[PDB]
């Protein structure tokens, strides 16, 4: 099956339209390239901001709101009949420091006096509420799906000990969801989003957290499985089990940031796309074949599958593609093998079904067929 141009290959959203929407994460510069725009028009019916809807891009100083970049994404989505997801209202990263400073400009995490801690909790929760209110009041009629909180459970199975948590305890999660519902109404859908949702003890910790909150009347409609995964790991059986476990609680599932790295963890990457050997693309394509067969089987539990980019010329995975060089200056990709130095983030990953020159990959054929 040929490496033809994606711009006029059979539409990916159309193959899957009774199953689930098919989305892409974007940057605003992509809305001004002809190729990106035509790929979004051709192949996708859902969109998400890769960066410009994060807390620090929206409210970088208290009272200063930048919606110019977000607005452009919203406008392109509406003009082209796409669903929109909001990524994301609360995170422990790409968050502005001003949130966690007390009245005299000192870090709140440092405060020892207990009545002064409770004042900070309330102040931070008030700020959290205002940030959410302003965003939801603006977008509630345009944006149907919302990452309310991101990564709030650590990998050790305990609540992640972010400043949000150190300062305000578990109430920050509750206030985030309650605030989105109050200002957005009943028709927006509210998600908790995380990675390694398939992995113990995080999976069960995630599960117990959401069940508890739902029991307490905290509004949560679903789980966002980021799905930054590899060719082998995690297995499909464990994905399937994960999806089913959350669906048992009456939660929707979205696959919110799908990419299939060519590498392991910590990754040892090739320095260029051209160096990646052909067999890696065939392996990837069988992984995607199994993957999307599983998504289809569970289509009644999954409303959306979104890829964390458009085509292989641009992916955040390249920021993790460390290249390992042995003493002779040759590239080392075997995980236990000798090496002398590493150039962090200088290599090239290849995670999507569309290549860097916008032609279809074997993984595409594997997910467009009905075999
Ligand atoms: O077991 C391994 C994990 O440790 C490992 O780590 C995490 C993967 O998920 C990440 O969170 C996602 C990452 O993408 C964010 O957007 C990017 C943030 O920075 C920008 O510069 C870039 O353009 C964005 O695309 C997204 O918002 C966020 O929700 C997390 O940070 C990693 O530690 O994954 C692999 C496992 O094997
Ligand atoms: Cl479309
Ligand atoms: Zn369409
Ligand atoms: Zn090339
Ligand atoms: Zn569905
Ligand atoms: Zn990017
Ligand atoms: Zn297939």
PDB file of C-alpha atoms in Angstrom, residues 74-339:
ATOM      1  CA  UNK A  74     -11.940  28.079  18.739  1.00  0.00           C
ATOM      2  CA  UNK A  75     -12.704  30.068  15.609  1.00  0.00           C
ATOM      3  CA  UNK A  76     -11.111  27.558  13.182  1.00  0.00           C
ATOM      4  CA  UNK A  77     -12.947  24.720  14.963  1.00  0.00           C
ATOM      5  CA  UNK A  78     -16.324  26.406  14.573  1.00  0.00           C
ATOM      6  CA  UNK A  79     -15.727  27.344  10.960  1.00  0.00           C
ATOM      7  CA  UNK A  80     -14.939  23.688  10.255  1.00  0.00           C
ATOM      8  CA  UNK A  81     -17.503  21.827  12.352  1.00  0.00           C
ATOM      9  CA  UNK A  82     -14.949  20.431  14.885  1.00  0.00           C
ATOM     10  CA  UNK A  83     -15.447  19.585  18.525  1.00  0.00           C
ATOM     11  CA  UNK A  84     -13.052  21.346  20.928  1.00  0.00           C
ATOM     12  CA  UNK A  85     -11.337  20.164  24.080  1.00  0.00           C
ATOM     13  CA  UNK A  86      -9.917  22.486  26.734  1.00  0.00           C
ATOM     14  CA  UNK A  87      -6.451  21.609  27.873  1.00  0.00           C
ATOM     15  CA  UNK A  88      -6.246  22.424  30.764  1.00  0.00           C
ATOM     16  CA  UNK A  89      -7.689  24.373  33.691  1.00  0.00           C
ATOM     17  CA  UNK A  90      -5.325  23.104  36.465  1.00  0.00           C
ATOM     18  CA  UNK A  91      -1.843  21.582  36.299  1.00  0.00           C
ATOM     19  CA  UNK A  92       1.335  21.568  38.496  1.00  0.00           C
ATOM     20  CA  UNK A  93       3.330  22.547  35.452  1.00  0.00           C
ATOM     21  CA  UNK A  94       3.098  25.458  32.987  1.00  0.00           C
ATOM     22  CA  UNK A  95       1.471  27.301  35.847  1.00  0.00           C
ATOM     23  CA  UNK A  96       2.204  30.861  36.893  1.00  0.00           C
ATOM     24  CA  UNK A  97       4.063  31.380  40.184  1.00  0.00           C
ATOM     25  CA  UNK A  98       1.767  34.282  41.207  1.00  0.00           C
ATOM     26  CA  UNK A  99      -0.917  31.731  42.151  1.00  0.00           C
ATOM     27  CA  UNK A 100       1.102  30.323  45.080  1.00  0.00           C
ATOM     28  CA  UNK A 101       2.535  33.589  46.596  1.00  0.00           C
ATOM     29  CA  UNK A 102       0.947  34.918  49.847  1.00  0.00           C
ATOM     30  CA  UNK A 103      -0.031  38.613  50.373  1.00  0.00           C
ATOM     31  CA  UNK A 104       3.568  39.731  50.984  1.00  0.00           C
ATOM     32  CA  UNK A 105       5.006  37.870  47.986  1.00  0.00           C
ATOM     33  CA  UNK A 106       6.390  34.884  49.930  1.00  0.00           C
ATOM     34  CA  UNK A 107       5.896  31.263  48.849  1.00  0.00           C
ATOM     35  CA  UNK A 108       2.806  29.808  50.506  1.00  0.00           C
ATOM     36  CA  UNK A 109       4.393  26.316  50.757  1.00  0.00           C
ATOM     37  CA  UNK A 110       6.851  27.799  53.338  1.00  0.00           C
ATOM     38  CA  UNK A 111       4.173  29.113  55.795  1.00  0.00           C
ATOM     39  CA  UNK A 112       4.338  27.371  59.222  1.00  0.00           C
ATOM     40  CA  UNK A 113       1.584  29.177  61.148  1.00  0.00           C
ATOM     41  CA  UNK A 114      -1.622  27.045  60.899  1.00  0.00           C
ATOM     42  CA  UNK A 115      -4.237  29.895  60.708  1.00  0.00           C
ATOM     43  CA  UNK A 116      -2.049  31.594  58.055  1.00  0.00           C
ATOM     44  CA  UNK A 117      -1.977  28.325  56.064  1.00  0.00           C
ATOM     45  CA  UNK A 118      -5.776  28.185  56.153  1.00  0.00           C
ATOM     46  CA  UNK A 119      -5.867  31.788  54.867  1.00  0.00           C
ATOM     47  CA  UNK A 120      -3.626  30.801  51.979  1.00  0.00           C
ATOM     48  CA  UNK A 121      -5.710  27.810  51.185  1.00  0.00           C
ATOM     49  CA  UNK A 122      -8.729  30.001  50.853  1.00  0.00           C
ATOM     50  CA  UNK A 123      -6.910  32.650  48.856  1.00  0.00           C
ATOM     51  CA  UNK A 124      -5.535  30.026  46.417  1.00  0.00           C
ATOM     52  CA  UNK A 125      -8.942  28.445  46.080  1.00  0.00           C
ATOM     53  CA  UNK A 126     -10.434  31.888  45.352  1.00  0.00           C
ATOM     54  CA  UNK A 127      -7.810  32.494  42.647  1.00  0.00           C
ATOM     55  CA  UNK A 128      -8.456  29.011  41.221  1.00  0.00           C
ATOM     56  CA  UNK A 129     -12.167  29.744  41.112  1.00  0.00           C
ATOM     57  CA  UNK A 130     -11.681  33.100  39.291  1.00  0.00           C
ATOM     58  CA  UNK A 131      -9.322  31.652  36.699  1.00  0.00           C
ATOM     59  CA  UNK A 132     -11.865  28.908  35.877  1.00  0.00           C
ATOM     60  CA  UNK A 133     -14.849  31.246  35.915  1.00  0.00           C
ATOM     61  CA  UNK A 134     -13.311  33.656  33.466  1.00  0.00           C
ATOM     62  CA  UNK A 135     -12.322  30.902  31.024  1.00  0.00           C
ATOM     63  CA  UNK A 136     -15.593  29.006  31.246  1.00  0.00           C
ATOM     64  CA  UNK A 137     -17.725  32.087  31.016  1.00  0.00           C
ATOM     65  CA  UNK A 138     -16.013  32.933  27.774  1.00  0.00           C
ATOM     66  CA  UNK A 139     -16.016  29.440  26.090  1.00  0.00           C
ATOM     67  CA  UNK A 140     -18.941  27.477  27.631  1.00  0.00           C
ATOM     68  CA  UNK A 141     -21.057  27.619  24.437  1.00  0.00           C
ATOM     69  CA  UNK A 142     -18.164  26.661  22.110  1.00  0.00           C
ATOM     70  CA  UNK A 143     -16.149  24.025  24.014  1.00  0.00           C
ATOM     71  CA  UNK A 144     -17.802  20.790  24.909  1.00  0.00           C
ATOM     72  CA  UNK A 145     -14.943  18.825  26.598  1.00  0.00           C
ATOM     73  CA  UNK A 146     -12.762  20.086  29.403  1.00  0.00           C
ATOM     74  CA  UNK A 147      -9.510  18.790  31.062  1.00  0.00           C
ATOM     75  CA  UNK A 148     -10.475  20.287  34.489  1.00  0.00           C
ATOM     76  CA  UNK A 149      -7.477  18.767  36.220  1.00  0.00           C
ATOM     77  CA  UNK A 150      -4.303  17.206  34.816  1.00  0.00           C
ATOM     78  CA  UNK A 151      -1.866  14.723  36.502  1.00  0.00           C
ATOM     79  CA  UNK A 152      -3.158  15.021  40.043  1.00  0.00           C
ATOM     80  CA  UNK A 153      -2.248  11.458  41.065  1.00  0.00           C
ATOM     81  CA  UNK A 154       1.453  10.598  41.472  1.00  0.00           C
ATOM     82  CA  UNK A 155       3.047   7.490  39.944  1.00  0.00           C
ATOM     83  CA  UNK A 156       3.627   6.163  43.524  1.00  0.00           C
ATOM     84  CA  UNK A 157      -0.213   5.927  43.829  1.00  0.00           C
ATOM     85  CA  UNK A 158      -0.401   8.844  46.221  1.00  0.00           C
ATOM     86  CA  UNK A 159      -1.920  12.292  45.368  1.00  0.00           C
ATOM     87  CA  UNK A 160       0.809  14.263  43.601  1.00  0.00           C
ATOM     88  CA  UNK A 161       2.388  16.559  46.162  1.00  0.00           C
ATOM     89  CA  UNK A 162       2.207  19.732  44.061  1.00  0.00           C
ATOM     90  CA  UNK A 163       1.864  23.212  45.466  1.00  0.00           C
ATOM     91  CA  UNK A 164      -1.885  22.877  44.751  1.00  0.00           C
ATOM     92  CA  UNK A 165      -1.864  19.897  47.130  1.00  0.00           C
ATOM     93  CA  UNK A 166       0.678  21.141  49.738  1.00  0.00           C
ATOM     94  CA  UNK A 167      -1.231  24.406  50.099  1.00  0.00           C
ATOM     95  CA  UNK A 168      -4.877  23.428  49.746  1.00  0.00           C
ATOM     96  CA  UNK A 169      -5.120  19.692  50.139  1.00  0.00           C
ATOM     97  CA  UNK A 170      -7.641  17.696  48.101  1.00  0.00           C
ATOM     98  CA  UNK A 171     -10.184  20.589  48.040  1.00  0.00           C
ATOM     99  CA  UNK A 172      -8.379  22.090  44.922  1.00  0.00           C
ATOM    100  CA  UNK A 173      -9.613  19.202  42.829  1.00  0.00           C
ATOM    101  CA  UNK A 174     -13.162  19.511  44.133  1.00  0.00           C
ATOM    102  CA  UNK A 175     -13.297  23.301  43.727  1.00  0.00           C
ATOM    103  CA  UNK A 176     -11.959  22.996  40.168  1.00  0.00           C
ATOM    104  CA  UNK A 177     -14.736  20.643  39.065  1.00  0.00           C
ATOM    105  CA  UNK A 178     -17.467  22.488  41.004  1.00  0.00           C
ATOM    106  CA  UNK A 179     -16.392  25.808  39.561  1.00  0.00           C
ATOM    107  CA  UNK A 180     -16.400  24.466  35.944  1.00  0.00           C
ATOM    108  CA  UNK A 181     -19.939  23.096  36.384  1.00  0.00           C
ATOM    109  CA  UNK A 182     -21.316  26.229  38.020  1.00  0.00           C
ATOM    110  CA  UNK A 183     -20.144  28.680  35.305  1.00  0.00           C
ATOM    111  CA  UNK A 184     -20.371  26.234  32.363  1.00  0.00           C
ATOM    112  CA  UNK A 185     -23.705  24.499  33.018  1.00  0.00           C
ATOM    113  CA  UNK A 186     -24.716  20.890  32.634  1.00  0.00           C
ATOM    114  CA  UNK A 187     -23.870  20.574  28.953  1.00  0.00           C
ATOM    115  CA  UNK A 188     -20.064  20.807  29.142  1.00  0.00           C
ATOM    116  CA  UNK A 189     -18.270  17.571  30.020  1.00  0.00           C
ATOM    117  CA  UNK A 190     -15.684  17.541  32.748  1.00  0.00           C
ATOM    118  CA  UNK A 191     -12.571  15.267  32.729  1.00  0.00           C
ATOM    119  CA  UNK A 192      -9.644  14.238  34.883  1.00  0.00           C
ATOM    120  CA  UNK A 193      -6.645  13.700  32.604  1.00  0.00           C
ATOM    121  CA  UNK A 194      -3.498  11.658  33.339  1.00  0.00           C
ATOM    122  CA  UNK A 195      -0.751   9.453  31.854  1.00  0.00           C
ATOM    123  CA  UNK A 196       0.133   5.839  32.778  1.00  0.00           C
ATOM    124  CA  UNK A 197      -3.519   5.380  33.675  1.00  0.00           C
ATOM    125  CA  UNK A 198      -2.947   1.721  32.766  1.00  0.00           C
ATOM    126  CA  UNK A 199      -0.200   1.188  35.403  1.00  0.00           C
ATOM    127  CA  UNK A 200      -0.381   0.068  39.095  1.00  0.00           C
ATOM    128  CA  UNK A 201      -0.633   1.475  41.811  1.00  0.00           C
ATOM    129  CA  UNK A 202      -1.663   4.734  39.843  1.00  0.00           C
ATOM    130  CA  UNK A 203      -4.636   3.121  38.079  1.00  0.00           C
ATOM    131  CA  UNK A 204      -6.293   2.023  41.323  1.00  0.00           C
ATOM    132  CA  UNK A 205      -5.381   5.258  43.081  1.00  0.00           C
ATOM    133  CA  UNK A 206      -7.000   7.186  40.163  1.00  0.00           C
ATOM    134  CA  UNK A 207     -10.007   4.883  40.413  1.00  0.00           C
ATOM    135  CA  UNK A 208     -10.450   5.250  44.178  1.00  0.00           C
ATOM    136  CA  UNK A 209     -10.061   9.040  43.884  1.00  0.00           C
ATOM    137  CA  UNK A 210     -12.761   9.503  41.266  1.00  0.00           C
ATOM    138  CA  UNK A 211     -15.216   7.072  42.958  1.00  0.00           C
ATOM    139  CA  UNK A 212     -14.864   9.017  46.253  1.00  0.00           C
ATOM    140  CA  UNK A 213     -15.352  12.409  44.567  1.00  0.00           C
ATOM    141  CA  UNK A 214     -18.389  11.186  42.663  1.00  0.00           C
ATOM    142  CA  UNK A 215     -19.822   9.812  45.950  1.00  0.00           C
ATOM    143  CA  UNK A 216     -19.341  13.296  47.478  1.00  0.00           C
ATOM    144  CA  UNK A 217     -21.377  14.979  44.618  1.00  0.00           C
ATOM    145  CA  UNK A 218     -18.225  16.348  42.843  1.00  0.00           C
ATOM    146  CA  UNK A 219     -19.178  16.625  39.135  1.00  0.00           C
ATOM    147  CA  UNK A 220     -16.842  14.397  36.967  1.00  0.00           C
ATOM    148  CA  UNK A 221     -18.033  13.010  33.599  1.00  0.00           C
ATOM    149  CA  UNK A 222     -14.907  11.203  32.512  1.00  0.00           C
ATOM    150  CA  UNK A 223     -11.262  10.238  32.385  1.00  0.00           C
ATOM    151  CA  UNK A 224      -8.665  11.452  29.860  1.00  0.00           C
ATOM    152  CA  UNK A 225      -6.092   8.785  29.087  1.00  0.00           C
ATOM    153  CA  UNK A 226      -3.119  10.693  27.733  1.00  0.00           C
ATOM    154  CA  UNK A 227      -1.771   7.551  26.086  1.00  0.00           C
ATOM    155  CA  UNK A 228       1.850   8.584  25.510  1.00  0.00           C
ATOM    156  CA  UNK A 229       2.829   4.956  24.879  1.00  0.00           C
ATOM    157  CA  UNK A 230       5.376   2.738  23.119  1.00  0.00           C
ATOM    158  CA  UNK A 231       5.336  -0.038  20.580  1.00  0.00           C
ATOM    159  CA  UNK A 232       5.117  -2.861  23.201  1.00  0.00           C
ATOM    160  CA  UNK A 233       4.086  -1.136  26.461  1.00  0.00           C
ATOM    161  CA  UNK A 234       1.497  -0.978  27.819  1.00  0.00           C
ATOM    162  CA  UNK A 235      -0.207  -4.040  26.542  1.00  0.00           C
ATOM    163  CA  UNK A 236      -3.546  -3.971  24.973  1.00  0.00           C
ATOM    164  CA  UNK A 237      -5.004  -6.288  27.606  1.00  0.00           C
ATOM    165  CA  UNK A 238      -4.016  -3.729  30.257  1.00  0.00           C
ATOM    166  CA  UNK A 239      -5.458  -0.859  28.170  1.00  0.00           C
ATOM    167  CA  UNK A 240      -8.699  -2.811  27.868  1.00  0.00           C
ATOM    168  CA  UNK A 241      -8.882  -3.507  31.541  1.00  0.00           C
ATOM    169  CA  UNK A 242      -8.233   0.161  32.321  1.00  0.00           C
ATOM    170  CA  UNK A 243     -10.932   1.442  29.995  1.00  0.00           C
ATOM    171  CA  UNK A 244     -13.427  -1.074  31.449  1.00  0.00           C
ATOM    172  CA  UNK A 245     -12.633  -0.315  35.006  1.00  0.00           C
ATOM    173  CA  UNK A 246     -13.507   3.417  34.588  1.00  0.00           C
ATOM    174  CA  UNK A 247     -16.494   2.744  32.395  1.00  0.00           C
ATOM    175  CA  UNK A 248     -17.869   0.620  35.335  1.00  0.00           C
ATOM    176  CA  UNK A 249     -18.166   3.830  37.328  1.00  0.00           C
ATOM    177  CA  UNK A 250     -20.337   5.457  34.633  1.00  0.00           C
ATOM    178  CA  UNK A 251     -17.377   7.595  33.392  1.00  0.00           C
ATOM    179  CA  UNK A 252     -16.735   8.390  29.657  1.00  0.00           C
ATOM    180  CA  UNK A 253     -13.167   7.671  28.389  1.00  0.00           C
ATOM    181  CA  UNK A 254     -11.190   9.832  25.980  1.00  0.00           C
ATOM    182  CA  UNK A 255      -7.866   8.987  24.555  1.00  0.00           C
ATOM    183  CA  UNK A 256      -6.576  12.550  24.807  1.00  0.00           C
ATOM    184  CA  UNK A 257      -2.854  12.660  23.749  1.00  0.00           C
ATOM    185  CA  UNK A 258      -2.110   9.542  21.674  1.00  0.00           C
ATOM    186  CA  UNK A 259       1.333   9.058  20.287  1.00  0.00           C
ATOM    187  CA  UNK A 260       3.303   5.816  19.686  1.00  0.00           C
ATOM    188  CA  UNK A 261       6.957   6.473  20.212  1.00  0.00           C
ATOM    189  CA  UNK A 262       9.584   4.540  18.297  1.00  0.00           C
ATOM    190  CA  UNK A 263      11.540   4.204  21.508  1.00  0.00           C
ATOM    191  CA  UNK A 264      11.611   2.962  25.083  1.00  0.00           C
ATOM    192  CA  UNK A 265      12.013   4.854  28.319  1.00  0.00           C
ATOM    193  CA  UNK A 266      14.390   6.645  28.864  1.00  0.00           C
ATOM    194  CA  UNK A 267      14.446   6.856  25.116  1.00  0.00           C
ATOM    195  CA  UNK A 268      17.574   6.340  22.968  1.00  0.00           C
ATOM    196  CA  UNK A 269      16.638   8.079  19.774  1.00  0.00           C
ATOM    197  CA  UNK A 270      17.976   8.307  16.258  1.00  0.00           C
ATOM    198  CA  UNK A 271      19.380  11.754  15.459  1.00  0.00           C
ATOM    199  CA  UNK A 272      17.239  12.178  12.289  1.00  0.00           C
ATOM    200  CA  UNK A 273      14.022  10.822  10.761  1.00  0.00           C
ATOM    201  CA  UNK A 274      16.026   9.338   7.862  1.00  0.00           C
ATOM    202  CA  UNK A 275      18.033   7.076  10.227  1.00  0.00           C
ATOM    203  CA  UNK A 276      14.938   5.330  11.664  1.00  0.00           C
ATOM    204  CA  UNK A 277      14.938   1.879  10.131  1.00  0.00           C
ATOM    205  CA  UNK A 278      12.026   0.632   8.003  1.00  0.00           C
ATOM    206  CA  UNK A 279      11.153  -2.298  10.275  1.00  0.00           C
ATOM    207  CA  UNK A 280      10.316   0.231  13.065  1.00  0.00           C
ATOM    208  CA  UNK A 281       7.512   1.574  10.935  1.00  0.00           C
ATOM    209  CA  UNK A 282       6.055  -1.953  10.411  1.00  0.00           C
ATOM    210  CA  UNK A 283       6.215  -2.701  14.106  1.00  0.00           C
ATOM    211  CA  UNK A 284       4.509   0.645  14.848  1.00  0.00           C
ATOM    212  CA  UNK A 285       1.861  -0.135  12.263  1.00  0.00           C
ATOM    213  CA  UNK A 286       1.027  -3.514  13.932  1.00  0.00           C
ATOM    214  CA  UNK A 287       0.860  -1.779  17.315  1.00  0.00           C
ATOM    215  CA  UNK A 288      -1.581   0.809  15.886  1.00  0.00           C
ATOM    216  CA  UNK A 289      -3.575  -1.980  14.186  1.00  0.00           C
ATOM    217  CA  UNK A 290      -4.066  -3.753  17.560  1.00  0.00           C
ATOM    218  CA  UNK A 291      -4.686  -0.491  19.304  1.00  0.00           C
ATOM    219  CA  UNK A 292      -7.449   0.801  17.154  1.00  0.00           C
ATOM    220  CA  UNK A 293      -9.060  -2.644  16.949  1.00  0.00           C
ATOM    221  CA  UNK A 294      -9.264  -2.376  20.738  1.00  0.00           C
ATOM    222  CA  UNK A 295     -10.673   1.198  20.635  1.00  0.00           C
ATOM    223  CA  UNK A 296     -13.312   0.026  18.180  1.00  0.00           C
ATOM    224  CA  UNK A 297     -14.267  -2.965  20.354  1.00  0.00           C
ATOM    225  CA  UNK A 298     -14.736  -0.534  23.235  1.00  0.00           C
ATOM    226  CA  UNK A 299     -16.334   2.182  21.109  1.00  0.00           C
ATOM    227  CA  UNK A 300     -19.368   2.358  23.344  1.00  0.00           C
ATOM    228  CA  UNK A 301     -17.079   3.511  26.184  1.00  0.00           C
ATOM    229  CA  UNK A 302     -14.851   5.963  24.234  1.00  0.00           C
ATOM    230  CA  UNK A 303     -16.159   9.291  22.785  1.00  0.00           C
ATOM    231  CA  UNK A 304     -12.815  10.520  21.382  1.00  0.00           C
ATOM    232  CA  UNK A 305      -9.352   9.557  20.311  1.00  0.00           C
ATOM    233  CA  UNK A 306      -7.004  12.557  19.892  1.00  0.00           C
ATOM    234  CA  UNK A 307      -3.433  12.367  18.534  1.00  0.00           C
ATOM    235  CA  UNK A 308      -1.003  14.756  20.193  1.00  0.00           C
ATOM    236  CA  UNK A 309      -0.081  16.379  16.888  1.00  0.00           C
ATOM    237  CA  UNK A 310      -0.856  16.281  13.163  1.00  0.00           C
ATOM    238  CA  UNK A 311       2.161  14.799  11.328  1.00  0.00           C
ATOM    239  CA  UNK A 312       5.610  13.511  12.132  1.00  0.00           C
ATOM    240  CA  UNK A 313       7.340  16.847  11.248  1.00  0.00           C
ATOM    241  CA  UNK A 314       6.120  18.165  14.621  1.00  0.00           C
ATOM    242  CA  UNK A 315       5.774  16.280  17.897  1.00  0.00           C
ATOM    243  CA  UNK A 316       6.747  17.132  21.548  1.00  0.00           C
ATOM    244  CA  UNK A 317       8.325  13.676  21.645  1.00  0.00           C
ATOM    245  CA  UNK A 318      11.404  15.191  19.908  1.00  0.00           C
ATOM    246  CA  UNK A 319      12.059  17.120  23.136  1.00  0.00           C
ATOM    247  CA  UNK A 320      12.512  13.661  24.826  1.00  0.00           C
ATOM    248  CA  UNK A 321      14.529  12.091  21.958  1.00  0.00           C
ATOM    249  CA  UNK A 322      17.909  12.026  23.600  1.00  0.00           C
ATOM    250  CA  UNK A 323      20.715  10.750  21.298  1.00  0.00           C
ATOM    251  CA  UNK A 324      23.371   8.541  22.767  1.00  0.00           C
ATOM    252  CA  UNK A 325      26.885   8.492  21.209  1.00  0.00           C
ATOM    253  CA  UNK A 326      29.629   5.908  21.904  1.00  0.00           C
ATOM    254  CA  UNK A 327      33.356   6.924  22.250  1.00  0.00           C
ATOM    255  CA  UNK A 328      33.842   6.735  18.458  1.00  0.00           C
ATOM    256  CA  UNK A 329      30.882   9.181  17.828  1.00  0.00           C
ATOM    257  CA  UNK A 330      28.494   6.495  16.560  1.00  0.00           C
ATOM    258  CA  UNK A 331      24.870   6.598  17.564  1.00  0.00           C
ATOM    259  CA  UNK A 332      23.759   4.107  20.260  1.00  0.00           C
ATOM    260  CA  UNK A 333      20.124   3.005  20.390  1.00  0.00           C
ATOM    261  CA  UNK A 334      20.382  -0.307  22.339  1.00  0.00           C
ATOM    262  CA  UNK A 335      19.241   0.296  25.980  1.00  0.00           C
ATOM    263  CA  UNK A 336      21.988  -1.447  27.924  1.00  0.00           C
ATOM    264  CA  UNK A 337      24.868  -0.774  25.540  1.00  0.00           C
ATOM    265  CA  UNK A 338      28.015   1.292  26.171  1.00  0.00           C
ATOM    266  CA  UNK A 339      28.035   4.971  25.524  1.00  0.00           C
TER     267      UNK A 339
END
